[PDB]
Each structure stands twice: as C-alpha cells, then as structure tokens.
Amino acid sequence: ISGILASPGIAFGKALLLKEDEIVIDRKKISADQVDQEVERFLSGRAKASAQLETIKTKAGETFGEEKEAIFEGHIMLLEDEELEQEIIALIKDKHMTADAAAHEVIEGQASALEELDDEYLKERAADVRDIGKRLLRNILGLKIIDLSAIQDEVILVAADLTPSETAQLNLKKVLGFITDAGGRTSHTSIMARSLELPAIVGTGSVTSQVKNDDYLILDAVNNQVYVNPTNEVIDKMRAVQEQVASEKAELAKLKDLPAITLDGHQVEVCANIGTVRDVEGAERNGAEGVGLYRTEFLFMDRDALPTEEEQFAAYKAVAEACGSQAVIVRTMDIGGDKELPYMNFPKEENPFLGWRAIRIAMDRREILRDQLRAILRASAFGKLRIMFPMIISVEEVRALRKEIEIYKQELRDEGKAFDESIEIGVMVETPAAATIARHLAKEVDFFSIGTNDLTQYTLAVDRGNDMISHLYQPMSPSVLNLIKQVIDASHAEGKWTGMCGELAGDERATLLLLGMGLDEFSMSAISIPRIKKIIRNTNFEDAKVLAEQALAQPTTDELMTLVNKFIEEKT
Amino acid sequence: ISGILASPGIAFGKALLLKEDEIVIDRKKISADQVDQEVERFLSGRAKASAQLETIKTKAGETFGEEKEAIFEGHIMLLEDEELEQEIIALIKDKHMTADAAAHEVIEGQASALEELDDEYLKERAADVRDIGKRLLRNILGLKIIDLSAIQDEVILVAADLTPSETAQLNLKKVLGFITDAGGRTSHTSIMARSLELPAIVGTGSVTSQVKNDDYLILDAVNNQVYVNPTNEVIDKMRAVQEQVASEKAELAKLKDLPAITLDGHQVEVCANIGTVRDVEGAERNGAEGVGLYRTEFLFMDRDALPTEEEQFAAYKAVAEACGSQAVIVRTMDIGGDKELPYMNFPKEENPFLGWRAIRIAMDRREILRDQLRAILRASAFGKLRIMFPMIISVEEVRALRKEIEIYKQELRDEGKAFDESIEIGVMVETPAAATIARHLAKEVDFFSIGTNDLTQYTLAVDRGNDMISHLYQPMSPSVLNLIKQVIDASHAEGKWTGMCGELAGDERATLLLLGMGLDEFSMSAISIPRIKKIIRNTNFEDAKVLAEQALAQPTTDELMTLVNKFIEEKT
C-alpha cells in the first residue's frame, strides 16, 4: 500500500473508514405479529439516535459554547417529534412497512412539506430533519455511526478523499493521521494536514479496499508505506523509525532562534502558512519569523455559517495579537477550489479550479468582500498586517480591489474605527496570467507571493488533486521555475519583494534554487521551517544564483534536477 | 432572450427542448392490481427501446457498414435477452416492484455480474447493458428520448448544455441551430457548431425555463437575441436581417480566391479548422488555403466505436484527398476536457480540463497513440499531411512522442507501407507551460499552432465552459497576447513558423495584432476565412507591427482595445 506522502510523521492506530455504509431500506411488507417488534425497532433506534445527540449536545455545551447547544437541542426535538412517532408507527401498523421504510417516508414527507412553503427558516428544518432522518435510519438499520468532531478513540482516517472542510473539524486529540484513495501532494487537504501536523498519505489508489475498520495500521508517512496488521517485529522497527524522527526534530530545533542567513550574508524571511489562530504555536515552535500566508478560508470553514465582520474581526484580531510583534499576510478569502464552503450552496462547476473562485466570488458579492476587508483593516489596529488577494489574473482586478480598499478605509475613518493607515497591499502570484503580467502588477501592489500550487496547476494544466496525472504535476519544471523567476524579477525591478507560500517554498529540493533565484520570503507549513532554515544557512547565495541560472536554462526537469544534484554533491 | 453568440446565423423554426430528465426509480412496492399494468409497462417500455435502436441499427449498416450495425444488433440482443425479461417480470409479480425498480435492479445485476469476471470484453458488455438499462428505464418511465441523429422535422434545439459528441450527432438537415443555458464562446461544442454552420447561442440564463416545446423562435445569432413566438412584423424584420446576412456572404465571397496579403506585401496562410471530410466543403467554399487543424477527436465522435488504425487511415486518406494539393495539419486526438467520447467510458474527473486529456491518454495507452500515428503516417502517402500534438506541456513529452513516431515509422518501412518521409511534426502551444518553454520546444518541432482557447483558459484559469465567469475569459489580455508573442518569436528564432487555430485567429478584433505580431498562419472555422482575409488584405503590415507592439505594452485590455480601435478609425 503506497500513495503520495502528503503530511509527515508515523502514526500507530486502529483504522477508521470514514466511508459511510449505505442506507438500504428493507422493502418487504411485514406481518401482523411483526408489527410490535418493528414499532420497538424504531423506538429502540430512535432512543439510540437521541442518545448520540444528547452526547453531541453536551459536547457542544462545551467545545462550541451554549448556543451551539440550542442548535442540537432543536435537533433532538425534531427527532423526538410526536408527529413522527405518530406517522411512522401508523405506517408500520396500517401499511405493514418496515420501521426503516416508515422512517424513510415520514422524514421525506416532513422535509418535503417544509420546503414546499416559501420560507428560508423552514427550508433549513427540512435539511435538519433529513440529517436527523439519516441518524435515525442508520440507527434503526444497525449501521455504524461516524462522528468526526466527536470521535471516541485514537484512530487513523481512511477515506476515498477528504475535503479541507472535513479536515478542518477533525478531532486532533483523536485522529492520529489519515490516508486517502485519491488526492495529491498539494491539495488544500494535504496542505492543511501539514499544519495540523497530522501524517497523511494520499495517492493510494485503493486503501479503502485494502484496509477494514480496526485494522491496526502504521501510517509510515516518512517512507510512504502503510502496514495493515503488522507483526510486533515490524511495529518495533517502526517504533525505531518513529524515534529517529524525534531525534531529528531535536537536532533541528537548534535552528529555532537562528536567522535564515546564507553563508555569504544574504537574509531571507522564513514564515509560516496558517489557517487558524491555533496554528501559531506550530509557528513559534518551528522558528517562524511571522506569517507569510493566512488562508482566511479556513476561518470561513471552521464554522457552520458565514462569518460576520464582527466575528472575522475578532478572529483576525486574535491572530495578530498572537503573533506579538511579528507580521501577518492575511489573504482574503480563497473558496471555490477544492475548497467547498458547503453551507453556501454555490452551484457545481465542471472545473472548480478553473471556476468561480476566491476573488471572483467576492467581486460578485461585495457584501462578502466588504465584511472581510473591513474586518482586516479594523484588526490591523492590533498587529502588523498585510493584505493579499488570491487568484489574481489581471491588473484590472487589482485596481478594482484597491478602489474597494480605499472605500472601506473611508467608511472606517468615518466611523471612528482605527486601522493601520500604512497597511501593505500585496497580490498572490498564482496564475500564469499574473506571472505573465508581473511587471505591471509589481507597479500596482506592495508585494507578491507566489502560489506554486496553483501556478503549477495552471501552467501545466494539471489538477493538483488528481492522482492519475500527478506525475505530470511538476513545480520544478523549467516551465514553472522560469515563471517564478519572472515574477521575482518583475518585483525587484520595481523595488518590491516576493514571498512564496506555495508548497515549493517548503520543499528541500527547491531551496537552493529558490534562494539563488532571489526569493525574498519563504512561507511554509511550520513543520518545514527548520529543514529549510537549515539549507539556507548552509548555502552560499552567490553560488546559488549561478546554479539557478543554469538549472532554469535546462529544457527538462531531470536535466535541471541533475544540475542541482551535482552542485549538492560538490558542496557536501 | 440573450446569451453568448457562438455560431453566426439566423434560424427560423420550432423549439425542440432537450429534456434533462433524470431517471427517478419508484422503489415503493406496487399494489396487486398494478401488476398486469407494470409487466406490460416494462414490455412496451422495452418495445420502444427496441424500436428506437432499430432505426439506429439500420442507419449504421448505411453510414458505416455491417460491423458497426452488428454493435446495435447486440445491444438489441442484450435488451431482448429473456434472461432479463424473466428476471424483470419476476420482481414485478413476485416481489411487487414497479417496472422501473425491477428493471433498475436486473440491469445493475447483469452488469456487475459481467464486471466480476476479469474480462476486458465483458466489462464492455457491462457498459452496454448499463447503456441500454438507461434507455429501457427512460422508456419505462415515459421520459422522452431524443435521438439527435434522427430528428423528424426542422427544429431549433434548446438544452441545458450540449456536449461536442451530442453536437456531432445532430442531423444537419433538420436541426437549424441551438441555444443552451450553459456554455461558452470557446467551448468545443460552440466550435464544432461553427464548422457545421449551425447558428448557436450559448450561456443564456435560462432558455430552458423560457422556451416551450414547439414554440416558434427566431434564433438571431448575428445580433444575439432569441425571439419567442415572434410577432409577424418581427418575423419580417428578421427575414430582412437574414437578407443582409446573405448579401454579406455574397460580397465576402469575392475574395474566395484572393490570397491573404496586406496592402504592403506581407503574406500569411489562412486555413480552416476541420472535424470531418465534410468540413472540407465549407473550407473550399470560404477560400481556405489548406487545413490548419484537423481535430481528429471529432472523427472519433463521428462513430460509436474507437476507430482502428484502418478506419483512421481511411478517414485521413479521404481528407488528404478531399483537400487536393492542400496541406492538412492532422492533430492527434484530444479527448478529455469538455470533449469526452462516451464510448470510452473513462472515469469522471474533478476538473476534466486540468485532467487526463489528449496526449496524456495516448501516452498511457499506446495502442491509441500507435494506431493513430500509424494511420496518419500511412495516410501521408496520399496527400500533404502534417502531425501536430495537443496539450503539450514539456520538452519531455515531445521527445517521448517523436521517439514514438520514429518507432512507428520503422514498422511501416518494415511492412512495405509508404509514408511521406518529409512529414513535418509540430505541437499545439495551448498550455502556458508550452508557451514558457517555447524556445526549447521550437528546436524540437517543425512548427507551432497556438491554441488560444486552451491557453486563455489556463493562463486566466477560466473554464471555457463556465458562463458565470465568462466575462473573465479574455484571450485579448495583455497576458495572453504576451505569451502569443513569445511563442511566435520562439518559432522565428529557430526559423520555424507559428500558426493559430484557437478562435482568436478567426476573431476580427485580433487580426491586426496577430498579424503585427508576425503570426504566420491563421486557422479557423471556414466561415471566418473571408472576414479575416478582408481585414488582412486591407491592412498595412508595417502599421500593424507598430500596433502590435503598442498593444503588448498595455497593462489593461481596455487600453489595448483602444489602440485597435483608433487604428481601424484612422487606417481604413
């Protein structure tokens, strides 16, 4: 069993397949003698659904507050609705339906009626009822129940795939790692997982049919294997591997306070990519100099509804303050990739990653763009904040966004609300357009950050979440690495600088190149900070610059890798 | 009603709605009277299914021959198999399911049984079974079945969307045009419609909800308006609008033979993109000097099976010969973005346009690449052909494919099979990767054709299919133009040439820029040949260079549109 290394670590744990068992309704009519057993089946499965809910309601009386409780209390009501035991019981008795057939039809009726009124609030109950519907049915049906937030024991997730949203809400005290059939190194799912410090392997093809619930697994995400029901002998070897990983952390932690300077005096900034306030420890721990990218999406995901200016402002305030004196590049919201914000019901697209994403959504719905930009400016009252925009392709877009920034700024001035007047405004360069037009853009913004995840996806036209072509996904191709050069240069030509938060900035393989190409700031998963700090400290910039120039002249990846390879053999 | 004009023309006819209708199975047990009913309901639902295939089968021993007719003979056989009649009947009668729920089950049953055996041949029979399940189930549930190839009367098609294959199967004598909710100017479906000279308007809000089956429309794909049940004095205005349209042809016609030479002596080629020998007619009609892109996919969607070496050869030979002295640029096959061929049953992808497309397939399944290249080469013994590859992303890919050609060349040599030893090989530059490494690629090929539909798509990360963001799909961006220039220049630096088969070549607004930027070859829908020829014949080339240069420095489309306009004002 072998996939793509996604997020590092070794994990020892029982398998939990997130793959939910299908609701198979028994459709054979029942007999008069059965009528009692079936009533009791439903009453039994209900009490069991009502159980799980009481223990999700008390959980949300804590880890979510005292309002999240009411939400789940309202659910319990929907389940224990006397219109339901009414209709359901009558279906079993009067039409000899299975308790599961009955539940299925009473629920559907209940939900369908609720929508058939012209109400947004009743349109929500119908979803609630259908979701309570499932819980009940699956409880009646005997099927297992999987609670991502409320996992009980230390497990390793095995699924076909995982959404960043799903990955968000994962209980960390309990999930030790995950493995998926599909995905790729550079999915937002894999990316997130890196800052959750959660080991993950993703391109497995078919883990979901090589692994069964409760198989003991060692997710070796150092050497890219999973072992299913391993011998004690294998476990022990894997425990030595686990320990060896810790020794490295220890040796590498010696770099924590050291700056990222090359042997010849060239300093670059080494920052962390974050998603949430909590990722900041990771950052402190790994010697971050600040935050090169704050993916605000992960906020919008962290919840069940669209965060207000108020709540965002609280959240960006906390991150700023949690970064003490250190700066933060807050990127405005990038939803629409492989980043579902489900609670919105944006319609399906044939190509989400070539779709209505990030900047395109906010510009379609100023409401969304206004709250956010407002929330960030108001929060730049309490920290050194920069603003950055995802998914820029045109100068036109940048200009429009600046207008908005200036409009929100006035509104703030007008309402006696403080913001850092000197706030720097930058643009992601993650689009072959933005790279092509970089000279121009460098004139309109304060800085760049290269998103090599998207730039690669788009340059090479390969979907970053698509295992089948992943061998074509090559951020280290002459294609992408020359676009990267262009961007960096365009920036310096205008006295501006370029960061990188794409996963390449964290890849040991790229550091010398990136370094020699004039990259100004490396933002990465906190875990990758020390190792990259290491190569930077053991590198001579001027030699890196000569190397990067011959590597980028190479016509194929291997010819290019080769140059890098020889250099590293000669230097070591 | 308006959307995005896709294919020019004005059609008059009754609406034919294309039913999205998705099969809903009635799982609820039926009552005991409903039995004779549903039994017969199945048999007749099937009689219909059987009937509709019966025309399709005979239209096959005509348009193709006995071997492609026998395909459906088998389909019929699988449909009429009494092993499924018996099973279906049993579940209606004994287990009291609807005709559809039984039929759903028995189909799924037979299909999974076939897959369970480890036989490529039966996995194919599986698919057929499922294919014919669909038709059976749609007939059982009386959902309408429009066989695009056997449309009775002159209609105008109205549909959610329309896939290239679908468009391929349109009875050209009876469908006079179409209108869809979704789509883009540059979607392959749109493009095919141009060579069929089929007026089309895509990307309306909701023509589906606004047009009734059998409404009288005047689809005006000249001015971008659809009239629903037009007033007779509107039926008149339009009829006169159609007159102007016809005179426009008559006038443009006069250039049929004239070369594409600017006033000051600069010549370019101007050719037709084609799909099928049948398009050669339009090309000759519109003064094409050769074929700049022979989208071989289209030939593949002209059939219900993968065309073998021999079928391809014949098809290519015909084209080569229907082109007389003229050169055809045969592109190897490009399946897998918005152009699937259903008969391949490839699996779904999250982003087809960033997925396993074109060359990525032929390289993962050599039989496909081999048959085809074999066929092209052999056809080159019969007329001037060139080979060109789609979706090229790296120098790696090109070398691997040339190496492939060389192998296939020898085999032909060894089998006593002529091929043009002079045969030139080039590549689509339609990826920002390709554009970026254009210099490198130019050493490795004889020529380039820039696919701006794709290049635009990836450079801007905007899906050619996605109407919601169509406003961002701008091949006339400073970003795409720059990349165009960079490619042309690459060509010229090696002493090769670049053509263009993307829709920009045919776009009146790019013609002066494309020209000024030194593009050697334009290839388009045949219908665009005269407009562009006209523009070319009436420009001064030197002036265009100056224009091009200016345009390439603009950071904004608008600013670049201005140049173009002041030119047109001052210069003819």
Ligand SMILES: O=C([O-])C(=O)[O-]
């Ligand atoms: O957003 C990013 O970090 C990227 O696309 O690489």
Ligand SMILES: O=C([O-])C(=O)[O-]
């Ligand atoms: O294939 C093409 O011609 C394109 O993408 O423009």
Ligand SMILES: [Mg+2]
């Ligand atoms: Mg990105």
Ligand SMILES: [Mg+2]
């Ligand atoms: Mg193309």
